[PDB]
Design a protein around this nucleic acid. Sequence first.
RNA 1: AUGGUGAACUAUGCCUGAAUAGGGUGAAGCCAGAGGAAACUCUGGUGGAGGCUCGUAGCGGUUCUGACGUGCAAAUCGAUC
RNA 2: UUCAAAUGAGAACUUUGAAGACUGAAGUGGGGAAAGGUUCCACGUCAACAGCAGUUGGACGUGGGUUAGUCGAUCCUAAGAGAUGGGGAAGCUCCGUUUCAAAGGCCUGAUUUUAUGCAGGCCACCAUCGAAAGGGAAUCCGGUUAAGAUUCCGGAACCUGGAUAUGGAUUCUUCACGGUAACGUAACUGAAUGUGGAGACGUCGGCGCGAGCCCUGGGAGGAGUUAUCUUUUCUUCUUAACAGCUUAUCACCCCGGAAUUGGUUUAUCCGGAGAUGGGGUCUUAUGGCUGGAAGAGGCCAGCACCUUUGCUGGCUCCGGUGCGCUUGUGACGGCCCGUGAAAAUCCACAGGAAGGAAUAGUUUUCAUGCCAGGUCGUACUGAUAACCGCAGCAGGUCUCCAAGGUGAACAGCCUCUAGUUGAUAGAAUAAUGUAGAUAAGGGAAGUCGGCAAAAUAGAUCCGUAACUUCGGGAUAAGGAUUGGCUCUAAGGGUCGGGUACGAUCAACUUAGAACUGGUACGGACAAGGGGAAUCUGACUGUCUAAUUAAAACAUAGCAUUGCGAUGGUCAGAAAGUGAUGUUGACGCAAU
Lengths: 112, 91, 251, 77, 50, 14, 63
Amino acid sequence: AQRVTFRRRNPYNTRSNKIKVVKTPGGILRAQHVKKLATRPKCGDCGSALQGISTLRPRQYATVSKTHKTVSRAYGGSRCANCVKERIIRAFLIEEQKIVKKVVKEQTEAAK
Amino acid sequence: AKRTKKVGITGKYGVRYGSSLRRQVKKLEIQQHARYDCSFCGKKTVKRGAAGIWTCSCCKKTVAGGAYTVSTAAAATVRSTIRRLREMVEA
Amino acid sequence: GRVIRNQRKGAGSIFTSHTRLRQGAAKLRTLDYAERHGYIRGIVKQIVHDSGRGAPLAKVVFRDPYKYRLREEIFIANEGVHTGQFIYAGKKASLNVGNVLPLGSVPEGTIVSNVEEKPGDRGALARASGNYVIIIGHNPDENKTRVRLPSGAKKVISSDARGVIGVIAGGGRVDKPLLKAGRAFHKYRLKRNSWPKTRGVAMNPVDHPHGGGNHQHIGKASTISRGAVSGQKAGLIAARRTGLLRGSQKT
Amino acid sequence: AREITDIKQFLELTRRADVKTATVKINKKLNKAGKPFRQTKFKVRGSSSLYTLVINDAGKAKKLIQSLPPTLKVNRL
Amino acid sequence: AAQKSFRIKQKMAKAKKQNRPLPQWIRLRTNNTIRYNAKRRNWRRTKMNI
Amino acid sequence: FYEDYLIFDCRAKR
Amino acid sequence: RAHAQSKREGRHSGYGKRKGTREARLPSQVVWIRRLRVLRRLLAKYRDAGKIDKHLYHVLYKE
RNA sequence: AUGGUGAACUAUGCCUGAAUAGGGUGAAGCCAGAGGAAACUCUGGUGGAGGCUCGUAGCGGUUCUGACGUGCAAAUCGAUC
RNA sequence: UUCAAAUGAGAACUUUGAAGACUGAAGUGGGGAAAGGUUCCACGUCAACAGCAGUUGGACGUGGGUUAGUCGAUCCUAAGAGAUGGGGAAGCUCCGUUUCAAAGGCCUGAUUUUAUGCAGGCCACCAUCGAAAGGGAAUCCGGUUAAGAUUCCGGAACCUGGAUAUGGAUUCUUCACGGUAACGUAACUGAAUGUGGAGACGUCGGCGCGAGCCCUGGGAGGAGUUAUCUUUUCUUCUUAACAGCUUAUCACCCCGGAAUUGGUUUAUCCGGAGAUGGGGUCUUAUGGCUGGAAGAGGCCAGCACCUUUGCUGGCUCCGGUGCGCUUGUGACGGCCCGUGAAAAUCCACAGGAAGGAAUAGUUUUCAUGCCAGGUCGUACUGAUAACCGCAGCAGGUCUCCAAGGUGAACAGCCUCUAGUUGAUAGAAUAAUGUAGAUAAGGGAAGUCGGCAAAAUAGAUCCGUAACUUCGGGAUAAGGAUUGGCUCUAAGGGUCGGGUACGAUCAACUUAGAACUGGUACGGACAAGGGGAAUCUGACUGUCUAAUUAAAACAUAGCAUUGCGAUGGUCAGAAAGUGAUGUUGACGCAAU
Ligand SMILES: [Mg+2]
Ligand SMILES: [Zn+2]
Ligand SMILES: [Zn+2]
């Protein structure tokens, strides 16, 4: 039934100051200051957590390699695979329909 | 079972605030806590987020509408008036 | 006497607005070249709630036509506007909902919102939940447009002025009773400190004109001239009539 | 801090020229209820990390010790 | 406080060094009228107000 | 400095 | 420990040793949760074994 | 009357944070079952709402017009609330 | 509170010991914020102070004492404050903070009089201040002092900034390969500009998971009890930051094509916009194994000595349970005319400027290796004695950890750990008091008034009116039961079947029956008096700090009024000034 202390000088139960109680090699209970939890990166289009990317705080994303932060696809760490698929399809298709819209007016005014 | 004859969702307000006001609030609370038909996905998923904001759980679309209903009658009228004037002028 | 509550509301100490959660000023796009020679396309990226505003806002994204940039405008959403929707802003734009035509470019009976009263106001008249402006007629000579405002007032403005087609969303909002001082407390917690209101007749005469008495009573009339000065204007300012409205508005 | 599990990496590591010290810790362990045995740990002090090699066969350990250089200061214990 | 400014700490240090009785050899000097330290301060009696 | 409250009596005074 | 042993055997649990409600001592929601977990566990085991088909599994789930 | 100092008490607003046992009642929504010369109701559960409630910590401060009333106290104490 | 001893001139009060007690984990404990400022600690010491005493002390006198790359400030913005330009003002100064301003600085270089101009190009924000509780680069264990410690020692790590070499990777198809895919890996060019994410977020409810704690079995050790009993009561059996391998609800991919509709949650949602099913990918919260690391730390035993003092050995293991407590977290649900910060900072992406190899090259987001990390704070109290109240004042003053039993319960009552045993004492026991209690018979006759007190009280079962806004009234009213012991019944989990059962493990919940007893039993604590009616205010809520808590104020609801911006209401000495207004009649202002 050992009781613990905040090991720093901030006494208040703030988000910055969460603790986990941990038993040490001395046998005692001690408080251990845990950092805030890391939130996953999201796709700009859908807003959903996008897999293959490591979960960290923003300054810890500068310690690690590219592959913890990117998938090998175009729009890797930024857009979901499905969003990418959708915009590929949209791109190709409405480019083709722009061609079609062009030749339509071309032959129209050529007729008149 | 049925638990209330006539107060329904307004049993949480108890005896307070008067029958006529509880009626008025019933008629709108039902409306806004209801699910509605999505015009894009065809499903019964559209639920209010806030006043005038109706979101579809599937299709993840968001629509501006009424505070307690998706479409006001006054705005459906506007939509029809507008369709008519649009297809009246070049036609 | 003492300075009264209405006089204290101009210093703006505790009576200012609470404007932190508000997303921004819901202005129309600046009137540049496109909006008066053609149209420009934008896309609605999200409809959101604005604190202290019963109408939702629409984050429309347009492109800058001069620099590779993606300037984002904050529109008041209209009833029927949705995400993924294309908005067309300009003179040569189609008469669909969400679009920002000029008033010269729409027929009579058209229903419009966020109307500029002068071109380049970027939003005025018909901005609140459920409210709309009607176009009555035109004057292509001395280019002018007659409109009907939500008040019943007929106004004449420029046909080069703009307006968003359709009705402002959030209608029916005041058809629900609040039932609760708490609900009203939270209503005004995000606008401004205007609530609760104590009655002058329940005050002391140092604090109000209506104050004092061995009975609660105004004593003198509550109809106050417009030529009255700050500290007297408590009651019914420049009341043309008073009492219960038994009939039409004689207009 | 780190384990290594192949002796060749360990020998490559002992000749890194930032390595100065090593220690050799003997423990007594129980694979099962029928046999206690002599585990050993070879620990090498790099400038930034400590590398540890766990050996459970004393026959390999007594060879690995003589496989060390003389430049490395060892601490038996 | 414990988390304190250097300026405050400095002014405290001065007060500490000042918290002394007389040196008793001043009383022996010629034409001396100082009998005791009349500016003497104690943490219970009188506060600094800094 | 002191304004004690018990000398205040209006019972039987007026 | 002696008192606990006696309690296990059913002692010291009559009406005169109860200062709290039945739902305070053991909630109805907890009992129901245990019960439904049991029934759903069983029906799922029976499906996976083949002692029951999905068409009966469904009606028994909802029942 | 002139010129200055004060929101460390308190009043109110804003920003940023923190704090608040166990119980009772048992609202919507949902499941099953029964009933129906057609129509839709009834029962049992689930669920866990409310500027609801009993009642802690906490905030207040009703009564004893109790103690004290040159006090422990220039407003406290105790029970009761 | 008591006894003894020691100290001393002297002991109700100091110290030690022995005993008896209390706080009783919503503590008289252990830490902090503010404030205080050396009160911390030692030595000496008692004239004053400690409302008696005093050998003692927060007193007196003399001295020592606060160690940081990682904790914080420092930095960012919040509400807001406030220079500049300009404009007002006789003026002290006011307005305003991006404004009617010519408001600045960043990469590559190009030269090789040479230091830095010209060469280009880029870029337009437009001071600064504002949080020791917001955001935020990174450290943990053990040990150590009279007094310091995430700061010192020892060991083991990490971040930033900058230098830089080696190895590896890559290239003659110049700037990687694999996988159907989800995606993966040790790495595996990428300037301007642009997008996107993180930072970055309510509240409540229950469900799941984890941690620590509680509980508990076996075993290895030590202490206790032992007239009698007790395979017994108590206690130790621990494992940090960091690193590596693995580990997941959600989400996603592939095959495939669903009604006889299925899957599925405590909670009812999901599916031809492709379910179930089969196979896989991912986040690594979290947990497990290993390293760290047993060498440490804990429990013990033995042999030793004026001594500094040790020296030597062993053991430090294996499990289980749960509406359990606290806490963290995940996936969901409910609420809203309430939808519950910002910025610094970091990353990724798009793009493709420029630069690049073959007798040799480019790359330092891969590994290893080198250097540095400044300034200030850091003691102690944090309160019936360190702060504020004139003081050693029963007052006031922000927060964290939180054992066992009873029991619904951080209720009340007893106890362990830790801490106090302080508050002027002695002797008697008159009246009167204060606090607390009891009382024959009566039963509000008392009194302005049932003031005060009593009575009631929990849980289970039964039963429950008028009235009603149909939601309530309602625990209405009103009745019965409750202990201990011995039994009974019911309610579960996991394993087991060619292509109906059996074994095993473990829970507190309910119900019942016998038996028993000076008919007692929510046995202490705890814990509603109720009913019929009236005046009044709808309710919840608020105020006269220190005589009035109310019927007063507010409230939702109602109604009225003004205003379409060159405006209404209000402010200012003025102003190129302001609040409403990040507004626009479903709004603002006034009643
Ligand atoms: Mg018939
Ligand atoms: Zn996506
Ligand atoms: Zn949809």
